[PDB]
Symmetry: C5
Subunit: 333 residues, 5 copies
């Protein structure tokens, strides 16, 4: 055998009982899979690499080059114990075998690589939905060793993160990958070193525009055509307003089907409910006109053209709606 | 080897055949994941720690400090056998390796830590839904050893429970974590000691308000505008009431889609069905008015203005609805 | 070692080549989890215990008391081979270790306990749904040994079944747990002994009442108010009947969404379709009245008050509906 | 030990390097679970048995009877390697242990039994849906050995298939179980022997009748009552036809929700679209009548009873619908 | 033993420390399972075969023919380490045993075969949906060895890919299977050789035609019948247009339920929204006619037949719709 595995006890780390051992980390991201608003999490696939030195794995040679071993030798040597903090589930791919790489140099330097898929939590804010922007991160830490036993750092600084050129999401734009570091404390175990991978997402607005904003505006404009119809056709003007109200209610109900039940109002809700109020007032206007006409007829009868309300509504309603749209799209850009 | 594993039989507990062995327990909660009303359960992730002494694991040293071992040595020594009572499913995280920690002091004291995810049952009461409050707990017990063999207790009393500062639920407010203890009996195996983790949840009401209570009130108010319309427009006043009835029915049907089929009435059902009855009576009022008008016309014909019912309805209906709202929101706060 | 495991061949049962060995069985039920109408199955969690004697496990002592062993010794001795007949899936809980107990007395008596979750088939009859009652059972049998090798029986007769005081289902009432026994034959392997666990379920009716029966009756009563409206308002009386028909159809469609596609009619279907027929006839009545009125007008014209049909309908329709309800609720209680 | 396992190398089949070894197969079917039209597959549970002879498993005795072994001895001997062709997923039940049986006679004959659940593909034709009939099969073959190494056959001919007396499907009738055999070729590995299990399914028609065919016929008949209403009530005759059209469209949309998107028309689609066309023509008839009446009035005005179209429609529409029904139900039986 | 396994160290590849070892690859495709538009992936099942030479597996014989071994010998020898690039999940079938084949010739040539199921990503473009065409591929590469250690190539060139004669998809047409090769680079590990399997899919259009395009055209044509109705029936002409608008909106909402939220418009959306605009303009036309008629009546009153707009609309609307259809079906074929 080229490696003297049987001569050592690999239940103890290199430098056991002494100074801490440094371990470097390098990463390449392969894909971003899915994003859930109800669960508030994301899924990622990536390659994870480790670097350290262990003098028990030294072997003699003349070329001084790395050699590759098959990968079932991993379970017989010491290996770091990284885990993903705040994750829900994860696994290691194993077809047609375990996706594991092991390379050793003659002096004892080791490279160790894995392929994993992780689901991790992300806390999202929906006050500007669907014109919102989110920030998420992934955290890496050792489970068992404190900073007095294992020192964890990025292998090459800022150059330690790479991404695939094919990374894409159908509903979001991805930008600004970078890495950071921070210490963490547990009240009963000690201090640990954490690594972070940060990125930002921006949602696409076109679908929501065409699917939600256009129909509501069309219904609001459809409510205005009743002001131009003769007031003597009562069963021609009542159903138009009633149907507009019902369709607006259906749109409002259908919009919320995909979202969690948060305790605050979103940007699209304001628009939809203002439109609903506009249509409701349009319905009340004709009732006022009809009542006043009947009262006037009775008063003229007891003594033995267009009403002003319609004429004013024809100008007042569109101007108010246009002003609301100006303010709304200035605030939410 | 530093530890003399091969010299002992670890199929027997420490102090086998004698007094019971004490085991202490410490916990840190990482997250609360999901809550299901149809299944009546919750999911939790946490770190679980054990403390005991075993003289077979003693080794010589001079510094008198804990040493950390890699974690594959767990399957060769004796270890406690805790399990979660009344749970549906659970697992131990295992990427990139088993999330396990093992630390031993020179005298033989042991610390053993794990990372687990559990789904557990909780019995919920929905009589005040959606203005309700729930209480749930998680139970820990040994499977095989009775109190004559193993003594289970909280390691530091009330200071044995910690929580993450990021614990959050989108639909609930979390409060009042605390711990208790109680004995349990099985008729064919004996007495056991149980540990409890208790907490309380309060639901957020804003979403339900805006989604359910506002539309029903708007429909009820929309039914009242017919009292102000001339009674000679029969096909203008019938469709308004009919459409209000149908929309109320649709809202009632849509509300129940997310809930289990309990054998009692909930708080929101009372409100919705009272609103439905209000709209139904609004429909019946116009039929009465029309019948009386036709009868009066026939009687006046055989001899050769606003009806009182509308005038009274205009005041009676809103006052009754306001009184109902006052009583309802005083009872359910 | 206290037990002489290495001195025996545990691939053979106790009393190999001779008379059969008796094995007793004891059970405690922990929970009933879910019931599926489309799949026709249920899920159960329980503790399962075995009793037998094996002289190869004898050890010397003075106190004559049971001793508990850690549980990894199970895979080195002989153990029975029970399985669940007619089951779809099952597993054994394994956090934080296998939920297994092993106790041995000095003479060689053994107690062996496990914690399992099972999904099993149950054949349900829905002719009286949703006022129905179902009966289900769970079956236990050895896989490999016939009655000439292994004798299976209940350990203490009728006292061998216990249940948790917290067992509950949100939609059903649980009653009448009991146990039975019966022999089974396979044409190519032989005779086997089976154990049964029987129980009964009764569904709660309140939700179905409030959700389905009340709206249909309200629609049927809403169809009757047209008989009191003047016959000269044709576009006021046609839409009322049409909308009642459409709403009844929607209710009928929504009711069936949760049920399997059986080849017979259920109790609720009869009620819903009779209501639909009532509303359809209500629609036809006004067409008859209108046609007769127009014919009479033409006949009176060519020579140069309330129609009887409405007056009779006002009494005939409610009486028939009340009679149908009396008969229906006498038959289905 | 009764069996001399350690004295042989069980990585080689019986008769290695010589003539092929015969293996017989016997089957009992326990249940048919589910049928998916969108995925076009079915699920089955069954017991699978194997028969062969291996002289390395001979042991001495006097009674000459089969002996049963616990079942963990399977992983130490040679065993056949059957797999299910064209399957999507499958598993072996393992509670409370692996559902495995092993019986050996003193001369070396072996019986080996398993309990499995399989999901397999079936290609379905929906041109006569929902009055259709389907045929499906399950295929069994060895993975690694060609016919020159292993000979696969039915153990007892036609008597090798048994079924449970409780096998049932809620939506189908099951009939005609039988078995066949055929050879298969792979261009790079060789020739193999396949076994088949065939059966037929017939769908139940009652639910589809009551749910789909009756409402469409009722809507078509409801369209005809307008021919008997006076032509001077325009806003009483337009809404009736419009509502019938809309309800027919809703029924058509609701019918297709459960089916895959095939590239041909089904039997129910023809009926629904013919009904839709009938209602559309009913709407056009009144427009023609109204236009002709207005033209006649203008012509009579410029010179200073029932229209024939209604009278003919009253007879022509029902006769055509009855003729269509006769032809349709003669073709599709 | 025929093979001298115990005399060698199989943690090192053949030709360790020297020139690279060639490995050939051959494939037969069994099925294509499912295609997801929201997830943008596909599932495939196939047989995978490897070819190489290892002199450590030589054995003496006279016939010079391949011999088959049981398959548990795989875990004791060296074997290649292929994996699927850009895949989400995969597994190896294992009933009734691992689907693995191992054949060795006396000189040391090896054949090794497996049966696997893979889910892999495919980037789809929906600008021409549902008249679109997609191209997908599957990628095979070694995980641990670079081109200086292992040379990967197609075993027989273009003749290395076979497909089953039963491969079918219900919604797509499959064509043009072929293979390619390309080198790949990782910035921290080196150069690797990749193999590709390419194919093309074309969707079936019949279902979408009958389900979506026909109803929208029918609604558009139904909007035109109002131009032929007398303008004095206001509550007969308003509801027709309103109902057409609402039904068009429902169709548009129902179409999008199955698709991802892309940031561009699809082919079917253009058609549906143009139809919606047509119906909206149809509604506005009658409002214009009514307003002009009322104004003319007032003007004629103050001094003390068919309107031109309807007559022109009857020709202008159908011609514009026909022209739009011509252009649309010329562009999208
Ligand atoms: C056309 C529509 C949506 C569809 C109807 O509701 C009408 C509004 C009018 C205002 C528009 C808006 C789409 C989004 C716009 C173009 C805004 C943006 O630049 C977005 O970043 C500024 C003004 C906005
Ligand atoms: C506005 C709305 C809901 C929307 C319509 O139904 C009208 C009611 C009127 C009474 C309101 C209620 C919302 C909840 C309120 C504010 C109660 C609370 O403090 C809740 O803790 C007291 C009075 C309640
Ligand atoms: C109120 C309602 C349901 C809601 C409307 O359909 C009207 C019926 C009238 C008859 C009622 C029935 C509910 C169930 C009752 C009370 C029966 C039972 O004791 C049930 O065990 C006997 C009479 C039944
Ligand atoms: C009653 C209904 C369905 C409900 C309405 O559409 C009217 C048709 C009329 C023709 C009937 C059909 C049901 C199926 C029948 C009875 C056919 C069969 O024996 C079926 O095998 C022959 C004639 C068919
Ligand atoms: C009948 C229908 C769909 C249903 C209504 O919208 C009317 C159009 C009219 C134009 C037709 C189209 C179906 C697809 C056709 C036949 C095109 C194709 O050869 C497709 O490759 C050319 C013209 C197209
Ligand atoms: C790639 C690399 O670093 N190679 C070096 C080589 O240059 C040096 O001569 C040798 C001596 O041990 O060590 C190794
Ligand atoms: C942290 C701790 O308790 N350290 C003690 C140390 O103070 C003491 O001198 C030694 C003697 O055995 O035991 C250990
Ligand atoms: C609990 C029990 O049965 N204990 C008995 C004990 O009474 C008896 O003296 C002893 C002699 O072997 O056997 C044991
Ligand atoms: C069931 C059966 O076949 N039993 C036979 C038995 O009749 C025969 O005497 C014996 C001799 O080896 O072989 C065995
Ligand atoms: C199938 C095949 O290639 N068979 C050959 C055989 O023709 C040759 O005589 C023998 C000598 O070693 O090698 C082998
Ligand atoms: C990347 O690292 C460099 C060097 O430490 C630092 O100056 C820079 O701010 C980092 N970039 C980001 C985006 O954090
Ligand atoms: C916590 O423990 C202390 C000490 O036993 C006890 O007094 C106190 O009531 C406990 N708190 C709760 C909330 O149970
Ligand atoms: C319980 O067992 C006893 C004794 O065998 C028997 O008499 C009784 O009928 C059983 N009870 C039931 C409910 O089967
Ligand atoms: C069953 O097998 C017999 C004997 O080979 C054969 O004659 C018969 O046709 C088979 N039955 C069927 C239904 O295939
Ligand atoms: C198949 O391989 C041959 C030989 O290399 C090549 O000429 C041909 O273009 C290939 N076919 C395809 C479709 O790539
Ligand atoms: C009826 C729609 C009115 C739209 C008014 C235009 C809004 C433009 C806002 C631009 C702010 C940047
Ligand atoms: C039409 C809505 C009437 C709402 C009446 C106000 C209810 C306030 C109740 C306050 C009780 C604390
Ligand atoms: C309109 C509802 C009529 C309900 C008639 C009462 C039915 C009571 C049946 C009691 C039988 C036990
Ligand atoms: C309006 C429904 C007409 C139904 C006509 C009867 C069809 C019977 C067909 C019998 C063919 C075997
Ligand atoms: C109302 C439907 C009009 C359809 C006009 C025919 C379109 C044919 C386009 C052929 C282009 C190849
Ligand atoms: C809901 C009340 C409407 C009142 C309308 C009366 C206009 C003066
Ligand atoms: C459903 C019956 C309505 C009766 C209305 C008659 C008013 C006197
Ligand atoms: C001259 C026709 C007036 C119609 C205006 C409609 C505005 C929505
Ligand atoms: C809609 C407001 C009209 C005001 C008339 C004085
Ligand atoms: C709605 C009640 C009116 C009472 C008239 C006497
Ligand atoms: C509804 C039946 C009326 C009978 C009139 C003679
Ligand atoms: C519906 C066709 C009527 C024919 C009148 C000549
Ligand atoms: C619809 C356009 C009509 C033009 C009349 C001048």
């Amino acid at each position: 055998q080229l490696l003297r595995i049987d001569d050592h006890d690999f239940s103890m780390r290199p430098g056991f009982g002494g100074p801490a051992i440094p371990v470097g980390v390098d990463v390449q991201v392969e894909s971003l899979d899915s994003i859930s608003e109800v669960d508030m999490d994301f899924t990622m696939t990536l390659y994870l690499r480790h670097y350290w030195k262990d003098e028990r794995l030294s072997f003699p040679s003349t070329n001084n080059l790395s050699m590759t071993f098959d990968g079932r030798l991993v379970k017989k040597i010491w290996v770091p114990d990284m885990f993903f903090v705040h994750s829900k589930r994860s696994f290691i791919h194993d077809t047609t075998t375990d996706n594991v790489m092991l390379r050793v140099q003659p002096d004892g330097k080791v490279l160790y690589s894995l392929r994993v898929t992780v689901t991790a939590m992300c806390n999202m804010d929906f006050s500007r939905f669907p014109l919102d922007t989110q920030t998420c991160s992934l955290e890496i830490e050792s489970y068992a060793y404190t900073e007095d036993d294992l020192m964890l750092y990025w292998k090459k600084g800022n150059d330690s993160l790479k991404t695939d050129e094919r990374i894409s999401l159908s509903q979001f734009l991805i930008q600004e990958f970078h890495t950071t570091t921070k210490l963490a404390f547990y009240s009963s175990t000690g201090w640990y070193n954490r690594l972070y991978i940060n990125f930002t997402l921006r949602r696409h607005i076109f679908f929501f525009l065409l699917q939600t904003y256009f129909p509501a505006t069309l219904m609001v404009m459809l409510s205005w055509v009743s002001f131009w119809i003769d007031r003597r056709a009562v069963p021609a003007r009542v159903p138009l307003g009633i149907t507009t109200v019902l369709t607006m209610s259906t749109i409002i109900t259908g919009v919320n089907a995909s979202m969690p039940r948060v305790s605050y109002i979103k940007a699209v809700d304001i628009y939809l409910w203002v439109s609903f109020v506009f249509v409701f007032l349009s319905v009340l206007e004709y009732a006022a006109v009809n009542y006043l006409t009947t009262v006037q007829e009775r008063k003229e009868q007891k003594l033995r053209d267009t009403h002003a309300i319609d004429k004013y509504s024809r100008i007042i309603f569109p101007a108010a709606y246009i002003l609301f749209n100006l303010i709304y799209w200035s605030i939410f850009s």
